[PDB]
Amino acid sequence: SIEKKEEVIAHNEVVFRSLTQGLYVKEVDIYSDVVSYTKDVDEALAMPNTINFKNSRKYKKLIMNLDLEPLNKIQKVIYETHLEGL
């Protein structure tokens, strides 16, 4: 018996994976081309994607790159209340 359910979003950012290598980007150069890779979601390069930051410019040359696979990362907390009788 679920009584109350609330869903909350902690973070919302975009992470880019290479189709071939399967790694995540961690760093880029002056031209925004990749300098490094990392196989860790927590350390990967991130573009903020909360509502105020949509339609960015900093990573246009990155997004257009076909080898890269953008991924929308979302972190959530949900609260579930229960009643179990006597």
Partner 1 sequence: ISLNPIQDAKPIDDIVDIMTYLKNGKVLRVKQDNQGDILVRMSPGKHKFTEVSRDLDKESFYYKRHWVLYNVSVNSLITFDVYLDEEYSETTKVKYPKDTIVEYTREDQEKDVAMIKEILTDNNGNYFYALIGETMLFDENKLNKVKD
Partner 2 sequence: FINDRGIKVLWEEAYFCPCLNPDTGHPRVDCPRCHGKGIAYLPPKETIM
Tell me which residues touch a copy of itself (CB under 8 A). 3-4, 15, 41-42, 69-86
Q: Which range touches partner 1 (CB under 8 A), out of 28-36, 37-45, 49-57, 75-83? A: 49-57
Interface positions, 7-66, toward partner 2 (CB under 8 A)? 52-53, 55, 57
Q: C-alpha angle 76/43/36, rounded to 5°?
A: 145
Six-digit token string for 26: 């961690």
Closest of 2, 3, 1, 12 to residue 76, by C-alpha: 12
> Contact residues for partner 1 (CB under 8 A)?
14, 47, 49, 54-56, 70, 72, 84
